Amino acid sequence: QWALEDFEIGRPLGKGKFGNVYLAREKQSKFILALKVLFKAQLEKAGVEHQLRREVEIQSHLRHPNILRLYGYFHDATRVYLILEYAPLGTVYRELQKLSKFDEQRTATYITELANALSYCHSKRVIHRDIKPENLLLGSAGELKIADFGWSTLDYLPPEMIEGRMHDEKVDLWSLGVLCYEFLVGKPPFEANTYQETYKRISRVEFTFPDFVTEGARDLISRLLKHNPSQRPMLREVLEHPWITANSS
Numbered sequence: 001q002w003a004l005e006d007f008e009i010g011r012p013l014g015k016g017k018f019g020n021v022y023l024a025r026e027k028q029s030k031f032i033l034a035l036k037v038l039f040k041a042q043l044e045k046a047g048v049e050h051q052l053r054r055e056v057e058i059q060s061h062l063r064h065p066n067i068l069r070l071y072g073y074f075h076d077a078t079r080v081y082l083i084l085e086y087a088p089l090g091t092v093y094r095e096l097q098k099l100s101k102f103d104e105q106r107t108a109t110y111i112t113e114l115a116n117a118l119s120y121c122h123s124k125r126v127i128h129r130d131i132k133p134e135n136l137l138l139g140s141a142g143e144l145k146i147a148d149f150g151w152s153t154l155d156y157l158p159p160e161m162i163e164g165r166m167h168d169e170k171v172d173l174w175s176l177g178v179l180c181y182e183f184l185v186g187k188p189p190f191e192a193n194t195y196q197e198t199y200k201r202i203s204r205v206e207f208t209f210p211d212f213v214t215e216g217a218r219d220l221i222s223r224l225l226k227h228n229p230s231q232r233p234m235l236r237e238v239l240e241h242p243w244i245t246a247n248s249s
């Protein structure tokens with residue numbers, strides 16, 4: 001179906017580990033989109049051809065406004081290209097750097113938008129690992145969009161994953177706890193100056209709140225960051241959580 005000659009290439013929109021993403025326009029439709037380039041030799045150097053292949057097959061079937069859409073993909077002699085949804089307003093990480101921290105309305109809105117994306121995924125038996133601000137993009141109306149590779153620094157990993165126990169649907173809820181914290185405070189809850197320490201602090205769920213963090217927020221974050229996965233509240237319970245409904249659009 002596709003080839004590189006079918007597109008005009010624009011400025012870079014981001015740098016991945018295996019290649020860059022560029023703004024691009026499909027020539028006949030004039031459809032604006034994003035295009036991720038991936039080097040094949042570089043892929044085989046780290047042996048992830050069929051880690052990535054299953055990954056692509058998955059998110060083709062995923063359609064949700066709070067998830068970045070994969071329209072299609074193609075290849076050539078040297079590279080592999082992914083056709084992506086263009087997200088005009090950029091990354092949340094960038095927004096959080098400009099603003100230092102987010103207010104409660106913004107935070108609660110993003111959390112709701114995330115929770116809805118994950119509910120959709122879980123309903124289709126798709127689970128997600130750690131979610132970083134770097135991998136959250138913004139659509140044209142300011143809507144949050146999840147963009148990364150999985151889909152089924154430690155700062156975002158839950159205790160069960162770093163301790164080498166059964167990963168599970170409940171990982172997602174840990175991620176919401178960390179993000180909700182980071183949105184309000186401006187840095188993640190178990191940030192340390194060493195990996196060894198960050199590991200240790202995550203395993204103990206050893207973290208504290210700045211004075212300004214309201215008790216509604218404290219409650220939600222404390223409930224999501226429970227060490228026992230099964231004690232973390234359901235996604236429905238998050239969306240219903242008083243502080244969420246009180247602040248979210």
Ligand SMILES: CCc1ccc(/N=C2\S/C(=C\c3ccnc(Nc4ccc(-c5nnn[nH]5)cc4)c3)C(=O)N2C)cc1
Nearest residue numbers: 013014015016021034070085086087088090091147148
């Ligand atoms: C199919 C799912 C998927 C595939 C590859 C992915 N990896 C990506 S995507 C990506 C960049 C990207 C994708 C879609 N839209 C944008 N929009 C955008 C970002 C920044 C700015 C900006 N302006 N000024 N400063 N920053 C403007 C627009 C960026 C990326 O970097 N990786 C690794 C993620 C998901």
